[PDB]
Amino acid sequence: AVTPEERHLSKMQQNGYENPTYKFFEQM
Amino acid sequence: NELVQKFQVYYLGNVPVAKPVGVDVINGALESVLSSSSREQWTPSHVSVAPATLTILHQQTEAVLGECRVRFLSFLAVGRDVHTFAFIMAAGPASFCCHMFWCEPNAASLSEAVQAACMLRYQKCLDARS
């Protein structure tokens, strides 16, 4: 099965991560 | 200051990009920079991950190659090649810059550290303003 390092890599590759701190200040 | 000890990776540089988010945006940026550089041109460096900032420093002179506020980091990702990491900064209100890295054995630890910084930061900001 897929290790912790692996599942998070596929997440990072497939969707990346949108910083909610950016959006938080942005909506203001 | 820093949350974890600096990451020894290669800084591939930074390029302007059109949008604050998207794996397509960062993979376009990565392909462009990789096509116009060779591994010997790459700048060995470490990324210091602090609560409020990411600082990029030359490998052991530790001179500052970039500093970036977490609040203006709009997006991060690992590229289709598992070694590559990028984040997009809102350099200004309508201006985006993509910072790119080559990581060995892969980008997992760096992306994790940077993602963790963003998630910590957001809770701290909600808490401050509540």
Coordinates of C-alpha atoms in Angstrom, one line a residue:
Chain A
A1 CA 0.0 0.0 0.0
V2 CA 0.9 3.7 -0.2
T3 CA 3.1 5.2 2.6
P4 CA 2.5 8.6 4.3
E5 CA 5.2 10.3 2.3
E6 CA 3.5 8.9 -0.9
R7 CA -0.1 9.8 -0.3
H8 CA 0.8 13.4 0.6
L9 CA 3.1 13.7 -2.6
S10 CA 0.1 12.7 -4.8
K11 CA -2.0 15.3 -3.1
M12 CA 0.7 17.9 -3.6
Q13 CA 1.1 16.9 -7.3
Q14 CA -2.5 16.5 -8.2
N15 CA -4.0 19.5 -6.4
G16 CA -1.2 21.3 -4.7
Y17 CA -2.2 23.5 -1.8
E18 CA -4.1 26.8 -1.8
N19 CA -2.9 28.9 1.2
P20 CA -6.0 29.9 3.2
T21 CA -3.9 32.7 4.9
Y22 CA -3.7 34.4 1.4
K23 CA -7.5 34.2 0.8
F24 CA -8.3 35.2 4.4
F25 CA -6.4 38.6 3.9
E26 CA -7.6 38.7 0.3
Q27 CA -11.3 38.7 1.2
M28 CA -10.6 41.8 3.3
Chain B
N1 CA 12.9 32.1 14.3
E2 CA 12.8 29.0 12.1
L3 CA 10.4 26.1 12.7
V4 CA 12.8 23.5 11.3
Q5 CA 16.4 23.3 10.2
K6 CA 17.1 24.6 6.6
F7 CA 16.5 22.4 3.6
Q8 CA 19.5 21.7 1.3
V9 CA 17.9 21.9 -2.2
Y10 CA 18.5 23.6 -5.5
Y11 CA 17.0 27.0 -6.1
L12 CA 16.0 27.1 -9.8
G13 CA 14.9 30.7 -9.6
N14 CA 11.7 32.6 -10.0
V15 CA 9.6 33.7 -12.9
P16 CA 6.4 35.8 -13.2
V17 CA 3.2 33.9 -13.7
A18 CA -0.4 34.9 -14.7
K19 CA -2.5 33.4 -11.9
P20 CA -2.2 33.0 -8.1
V21 CA -3.0 29.2 -8.2
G22 CA -2.9 26.0 -10.3
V23 CA -0.8 22.9 -10.8
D24 CA -0.8 23.8 -14.6
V25 CA 0.7 27.2 -13.7
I26 CA 3.5 25.8 -11.7
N27 CA 4.3 23.0 -14.1
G28 CA 4.4 25.5 -17.0
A29 CA 6.9 27.5 -14.9
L30 CA 9.0 24.4 -14.1
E31 CA 9.2 23.2 -17.7
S32 CA 10.2 26.7 -18.8
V33 CA 13.1 27.1 -16.3
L34 CA 14.3 23.5 -16.7
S35 CA 14.5 23.9 -20.5
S36 CA 16.7 27.0 -20.1
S37 CA 19.2 25.9 -17.5
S38 CA 21.5 22.9 -16.8
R39 CA 22.1 21.2 -13.5
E40 CA 25.5 23.0 -13.1
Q41 CA 23.7 26.3 -13.3
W42 CA 21.5 25.4 -10.3
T43 CA 22.1 27.3 -7.1
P44 CA 22.6 25.0 -4.0
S45 CA 20.6 26.5 -1.2
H46 CA 18.5 26.0 1.9
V47 CA 15.0 27.0 2.7
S48 CA 14.4 28.3 6.2
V49 CA 10.8 27.8 7.2
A50 CA 9.7 30.2 9.9
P51 CA 6.2 31.0 11.3
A52 CA 5.7 34.1 9.1
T53 CA 8.3 33.8 6.3
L54 CA 10.2 31.5 4.1
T55 CA 13.8 32.5 3.5
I56 CA 15.9 31.0 0.7
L57 CA 19.7 31.1 1.4
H58 CA 22.9 30.0 -0.6
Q59 CA 24.1 26.5 0.5
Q60 CA 26.5 27.4 3.3
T61 CA 27.5 31.0 2.9
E62 CA 23.8 31.3 4.0
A63 CA 23.4 34.6 2.0
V64 CA 19.8 35.6 1.3
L65 CA 18.4 34.6 -2.1
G66 CA 14.7 35.4 -1.3
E67 CA 12.4 36.0 1.6
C68 CA 8.6 35.5 1.3
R69 CA 5.8 36.2 3.7
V70 CA 3.5 33.2 4.2
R71 CA 0.4 35.5 4.0
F72 CA 1.3 36.4 0.4
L73 CA 2.0 32.8 -0.7
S74 CA -1.0 32.0 -2.7
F75 CA -0.3 28.4 -3.8
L76 CA 2.2 25.6 -3.6
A77 CA 2.7 22.2 -5.2
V78 CA 5.0 19.4 -6.1
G79 CA 5.5 19.2 -9.9
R80 CA 4.8 16.2 -12.1
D81 CA 8.4 15.3 -11.5
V82 CA 8.5 14.4 -7.8
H83 CA 11.8 16.3 -7.3
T84 CA 10.3 19.7 -8.2
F85 CA 8.7 22.1 -5.7
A86 CA 7.1 25.5 -6.5
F87 CA 5.1 28.2 -4.7
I88 CA 3.4 31.2 -6.1
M89 CA 3.7 34.6 -4.3
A90 CA 1.5 37.5 -4.8
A91 CA 4.5 40.0 -5.3
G92 CA 1.9 42.8 -5.5
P93 CA -2.0 43.1 -5.7
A94 CA -2.0 42.0 -9.4
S95 CA 1.5 40.5 -9.7
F96 CA 2.5 36.8 -9.3
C97 CA 5.9 35.3 -9.0
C98 CA 6.7 31.5 -9.0
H99 CA 9.7 30.3 -7.0
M100 CA 11.1 26.9 -8.0
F101 CA 13.3 24.2 -6.5
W102 CA 14.8 20.8 -7.3
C103 CA 14.8 18.5 -4.2
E104 CA 16.7 15.3 -3.5
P105 CA 15.6 12.6 -3.0
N106 CA 12.2 14.3 -3.6
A107 CA 10.3 17.4 -2.6
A108 CA 8.2 15.7 0.1
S109 CA 9.9 17.2 3.2
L110 CA 10.1 20.8 1.8
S111 CA 6.5 20.9 0.5
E112 CA 5.3 19.5 3.9
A113 CA 7.2 22.1 5.8
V114 CA 5.9 24.9 3.7
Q115 CA 2.3 23.6 3.7
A116 CA 2.5 23.2 7.5
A117 CA 3.7 26.9 7.8
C118 CA 0.6 28.1 5.8
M119 CA -1.8 26.0 7.9
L120 CA -0.3 27.2 11.2
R121 CA -0.3 30.8 10.0
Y122 CA -3.9 30.8 9.0
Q123 CA -5.1 29.6 12.4
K124 CA -2.8 32.2 14.1
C125 CA -4.5 34.9 12.0
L126 CA -8.0 33.8 12.7
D127 CA -7.1 33.7 16.4
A128 CA -5.5 37.2 16.4
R129 CA -8.6 38.7 14.8
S130 CA -11.2 36.8 16.8

